């Protein structure tokens, strides 16, 4: 009764954590991609300012 | 049954931590998007 309520709440939290963890993985993946893009962009700009920056 | 309450409390705390991290990560990627846009606008001066 109370036991079942607790069991469900725990199980719910465990399922919530796994979704949270999956989201985090996707986010960190997205971050690395944007990081690489920022580098590509900065390197590209540097072609034009190599000597004078 | 105290074991279940302690277990639940720990998961609650962990969920709070996960949620805080997600907020940070999301703010970060929003900000990387702005840098990217800023850098593209800059590159457009050179093409």
Resolution in A: 2.3
Interchain contact A48–B (C-beta under 8 A):
yes
Q: By the 8 A CB rule, do B28 and A31 touch?
A: yes
Kindly determine whether residue B11 and residue A17, on different chains, have CB atoms separated by under 8 Å: yes
> Residue A28 is part of which domain span?
1-53
Separation in Å, CA of A16 to nearest CA in chain B: 8
Give Cα separations from A10 to A4, B11, B47 (angstroms): 10, 7, 56
Interchain contact A22–B (C-beta under 8 A):
no
Cα(A4)–Cα(A13) distance, rounded to whole angstroms? Answer: 14
The number of folded domains in chain B is 1
Q: By the 8 A CB rule, do A35 and B32 touch?
A: yes
CATH number at residue B34: 1.20.5.170
Method of structure determination: X-ray
Interchain contact B38–A (C-beta under 8 A):
no
Interchain contact B5–A (C-beta under 8 A):
yes
CA angle B9/A12/A17 to nearest 5° reads: 75
- What b-and-e string marks burial along B11-44, b requiring 16 or more CB atoms within 10 Å of the CB? beebeeebeeeeeebeeebeebeeeeeebeeeee
Separation in Å, CA of A51 to nearest CA in chain B: 15
């Amino acid at each position: 009764g109370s036991l079942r309520d607790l069991q469900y709440a725990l199980q719910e939290k465990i399922e919530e954590l796994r979704q949270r963890d999956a989201l985090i993985d996707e986010l960190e993946l997205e971050l690395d991609q944007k990081d690489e893009l920022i580098q590509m962009l900065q390197n590209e700009l540097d072609k034009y300012r190599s000597v004078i920056r």
